[PDB]
From a paper:
SARS-CoV-2 is an enveloped positive-stranded RNA virus that depends on fusion of viral and target cell membranes to enter a host cell. This first key step of infection is catalyzed by the virus-encoded trimeric spike (S) protein, which is also a major surface antigen and thus an important target for development of diagnostics, vaccines, and therapeutics. The RBD can adopt two distinct conformations: “up” for a receptor-accessible state and “down” for a receptor-inaccessible state.
3D classification identified five distinct classes for the B.1.1.7 S trimer—representing one closed prefusion conformation, three one-RBD-up conformations, and one two-RBD-up conformation—and two different classes for the B.1.351 trimer, representing a closed conformation and a one-RBD-up conformation. For the B.1.1.7 S trimer, most particles used for refinement were in the RBD-up conformation. The second 630 loop is partially ordered, whereas the third one remains disordered. A similar pattern is found for three FPPRs, although the structured FPPR adopts a conformation distinct from the one seen in our previous structures of the full-length S proteins. The B.1.1.7 virus is the most sensitive to the trimeric ACE2 and the RBD-up–targeting C63C7, suggesting that the B.1.1.7 trimer may prefer the RBD-up conformation.
Numbering used by the authors:
A (entry chain C): 923 to 1162
B (entry chain A): 729 to 837, 849 to 1067
C (entry chain C): 689 to 728
D (entry chain A): 1116 to 1162
Write the structure that this text describes.
């Protein structure tokens, strides 16, 4: 498990080195803010129907009475270019906040905890996550248990032993085709079916697809081996 | 999950086929490039939203031909092979109930084409047949494999043993399923019956998808009607100005129309950017519900329907997703 | 010898899962995997 | 039963505790294992 974690962290180094695409979600936010600023600055070059976009040339080439009519145009068009930019930035900031509140939620639930939320803390069953910082962002290294090599097995919802029906306490009943076992839900580790691994409810009739198998009682060999010590004491007591 | 991908050309809208008006529009600099970019960003995001909600499974799972799900009858939510589009029975109720609103928008605004006002409706990246095939894979995975196809490969489990794994999840012992399995299957079948009956009978229930179609329809009505506004010019028809006046007396009139129209687009694009943010919030919630109610069982109270959550079944709708949540 | 090609996209690999009313798959082994996720 | 339950402390600490018997399934097994034993002893008083 350590060697798989150590190997998987080795693939994180290789991935983050090998492709420029890896941090695309951060680079897209730098690129959109750079684009929005570069556009806002280019609107200073626009005429808006004044005789020049250069405010000092308008002021040099015209007297006060005419210059106000040209500068009114430039103010109206530049003011709309700020109100455009600031609307894009207020809307953008809401997408970055939603992302920051999600990142704060993943910090709380994947780093400071362990999450039952499926596919929230990465793909697979969540073990734990490690934060790493990035330019204007956060990277989570999510560690997950992924089940990897399955066998098929025959299975049953219950066992009948003494006409009473038995169910797993935890895990599931499985067979290799010759014997019946109980095993944990996410990892094949078979065990003999016992009165500790199983709980009883009702007769054998009501459970659809139930199967007959022995259920071992772990106290029975204690009372049988204690009965053979008792039988040796009685047989010995025939002899004096 | 999405809204209609609408791209307006800011040049076509403001100055439709007038080179005179186009030469004047250039004096305002980048605003039309910026407005076409803004709408294109919204259109790309509709595919992102739809892919994040539905494409959560990387294999297309088939349902078995032998329908022995322990007495549970998924026939109303699995694909009907006999239909042209391979939708479920319940997905066709959802499809007809919202397409009776879509067809209005499509004829007012399926090889869609640009109108003379510059309005264009683009197709989604995923056809309704591809959303049905992803939704089939999610449902076929759920009923054959339980939550395991969310975490690993799909691992088969018998459906009544899956429902026992689920009953343990809500803190009910698994014999309470098996001792009652015909009753649990009959109540499930009767409840999927009531979903089907309700979706056929109801006027109001799909209002949450009607609203998204109606807002986009009304914002395009408003945007197109503002082409009739004079903005104090001698006419609101652009050719009727260039016919009547000369190369200098016209420009004062054309610039009025450029100013007012451009403001009408700047308004529409702001409503649409704020809207797209609300549909992306709804898509991120739908993606979270798909991941936590379909690909797993949720211990989050009331997140997957009013009850204790067992499992959920996704169904496609036009512009949306429906979850049939199953609850104890 | 490369060219621009246009196609109907595949949604993913096909899989008919071997379901039956009495059969289960259980993993003998597992992979620990570390997946990066990046948030602005 | 003693399987359905677990023990901690004594009666005086829990507000609103109630007296009832708690059954032990090891016990009637051990009593059946006494009645199997006592009949043996009694038979072996006989010869
Ligand atoms: C199903 O799982 C069973 C438990 O692992 C397994 O049974 C066990 O099989 C091995 C042989 O593969 C037996 O090993 C003994 O075999 C003979 C018995 O006479 C001896 O000569 C050997 O030295 C050795 O002791 C186990 O005793 C046996 N366990 C039981 C409880 O019977 C089955 O073989 C598995 N079946 C399949 C189809 O996988
Ligand atoms: C699981 O184990 C059970 C106990 O061994 C077994 O039940 C037994 O089944 C047979 C056949 O149904 C019954 O035999 C009787 O059948 C009728 C009367 O019902 C008569 O014609 C026969 O002469 C005979 O009396 C047994 O009585 C019955 N035993 C009990 C305690 O009910 C199940 O059949 C086994 N099932 C499987 C799938 O292994
Ligand atoms: C678990 O078993 C299933 C079905 O049972 C087997 O089917 C035959 C292949 C034969 O070996 C029988 O004796 C078995 O009982 C397996 O499903 C088959 O998988 C193969 C690919 O490996 C596929 O080509 C077949 O179409 C499948 N069979 C059917 C009836 O469709 C399944 O692969 C086994 N699981 C594992 C993990 O090995
Ligand atoms: C699953 O439920 C459907 C009904 O929703 C069942 O189909 C009906 O079957 C009866 C008997 O053949 C017919 O009289 C009905 O007209 C059918 N209705 C429809 C809509 O097809 C179907 O048989 C059920 N499947 C199982 C396995 O019980
Ligand atoms: C479980 O999977 C691991 C790999 O994650 C297997 O470990 C490898 O085993 C082979 C021999 O079978 C060795 O050559 C490799 O060097 C091992 N790798 C590591 C990282 O230890 C392991 O054998 C598998 N076990 C089972 C029971 O399938
Ligand atoms: C436990 C149980 O009912 N198993 C049945 C089996 O008897 C039947 O042959 C098969 C056919 O689909 O379906 C399953
Ligand atoms: C029988 O009991 C006597 C003590 O009374 C003891 O010394 C002897 O070893 C016993 N033998 C066996 C086989 O129990
Ligand atoms: C419950 O309330 C009554 C008074 O109405 C009181 O006499 C009794 O002791 C209370 N029970 C417990 C367990 O506190
Ligand atoms: C006592 O047990 C013996 C066998 O050990 C038997 O022959 C005899 O009949 C029994 N007698 C009584 C009265 O139990």
């Amino acid at each position: 498990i350590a060697n798989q974690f150590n190997s998987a962290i080795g693939k994180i180094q290789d991935s983050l080195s090998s492709t420029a695409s890896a941090l695309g979600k951060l680079q897209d936010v730098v690129n959109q803010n750079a684009q929005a600023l570069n556009t806002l600055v280019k609107q200073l070059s626009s005429n808006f129907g004044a005789i020049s976009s250069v405010l000092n040339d308008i002021l040099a080439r015209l007297d006060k009475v005419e210059a106000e009519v040209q500068i009114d145009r430039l103010i109206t068009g530049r003011l709309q270019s700020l109100q455009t930019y600031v609307t894009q930035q207020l809307i953008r900031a809401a997408e970055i906040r939603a992302s920051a509140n999600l990142a704060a939620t993943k910090m709380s639930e994947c780093v400071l905890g362990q999450s039952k939320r499926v596919d929230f803390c990465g793909k697979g069953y969540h073990l734990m996550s490690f934060p790493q910082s990035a330019p204007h962002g956060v990277v989570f290294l999510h560690v997950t248990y992924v089940p990897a090599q399955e066998k098929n097995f025959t299975t049953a919802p219950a066992i009948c032993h003494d006409g009473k029906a038995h169910f797993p306490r935890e895990g599931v009943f499985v067979s290799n085709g010759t014997h019946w076992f109980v095993t944990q839900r996410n990892f094949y580790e078979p065990q003999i079916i016992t009165t500790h691994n199983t709980f009883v409810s009702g007769n054998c009739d009501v459970v659809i697809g139930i199967v007959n198998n022995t259920v071992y009682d772990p106290l029975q060999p204690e009372l049988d081996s204690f009965k053979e010590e008792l039988d040796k004491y009685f047989k010995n007591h025939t002899s004096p | 999950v999405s809204m209609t991908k609408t791209s307006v050309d800011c040049t076509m809208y403001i100055c439709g086929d007038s080179t005179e008006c186009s030469n004047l529009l250039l004096q305002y600099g980048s605003f039309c490039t910026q407005l076409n970019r803004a709408l294109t960003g919204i259109a790309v995001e509709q595919d992102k939203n739809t892919q994040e909600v539905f494409a959560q499974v990387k294999q297309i799972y088939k349902t078995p031909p032998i329908k022995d799900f322990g007495g549970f009858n998924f026939s109303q939510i699995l694909p009907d092979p006999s239909k042209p589009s391979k939708r479920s029975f319940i997905e066709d109720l959802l499809f007809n109930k919202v397409t009776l609103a879509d067809a209005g928008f499509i004829k007012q605004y399926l090889i869609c084409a640009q109108k003379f006002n510059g309005l264009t409706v683009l197709p989604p990246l995923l056809t309704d047949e591809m959303i049905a095939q992803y939704t089939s894979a999610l449902l076929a995975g759920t009923i054959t494999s339980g939550w395991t196809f969310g975490a690993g490969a799909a691992l088969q489990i018998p459906f009544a043993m899956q429902m026992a794994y689920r009953f343990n999840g809500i803190g009910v012992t698994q014999n309470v399923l098996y001792e009652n399995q015909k009753l649990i299957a009959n109540q499930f079948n009767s409840a999927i019956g009531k979903i089907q009956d309700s979706l056929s009978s109801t006027a109001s229930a799909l209002g949450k998808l009607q609203d998204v179609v109606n807002q986009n329809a009304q914002a395009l009505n408003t945007l197109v009607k503002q082409l009739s506004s004079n903005f104090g010019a001698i006419s609101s028809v652009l050719n009727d100005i260039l016919a009547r006046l000369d190369k200098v007396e016209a420009e004062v009139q054309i610039d009025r129309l450029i100013t007012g129209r451009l403001q009408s687009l700047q308004t529409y694009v702001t409503q649409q950017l704020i809207r797209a943010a609300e549909i992306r919030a709804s898509a991120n919630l739908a993606a979270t519900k798909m991941s936590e109610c379909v690909l797993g069982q949720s211990k989050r109270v009331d997140f997957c329907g009013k009850g204790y959550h067992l499992m959920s079944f996704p169904q496609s709708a036009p512009h949306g997703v429906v979850f049939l949540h199953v609850t104890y | 010898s490369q060219s621009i090609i246009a196609y109907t996209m595949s949604l993913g690999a096909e899989n008919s899962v071997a379901y039956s009313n009495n059969s289960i798959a259980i993993p003998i082994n597992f992979t620990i995997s570390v997946t990066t996720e990046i948030l602005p």
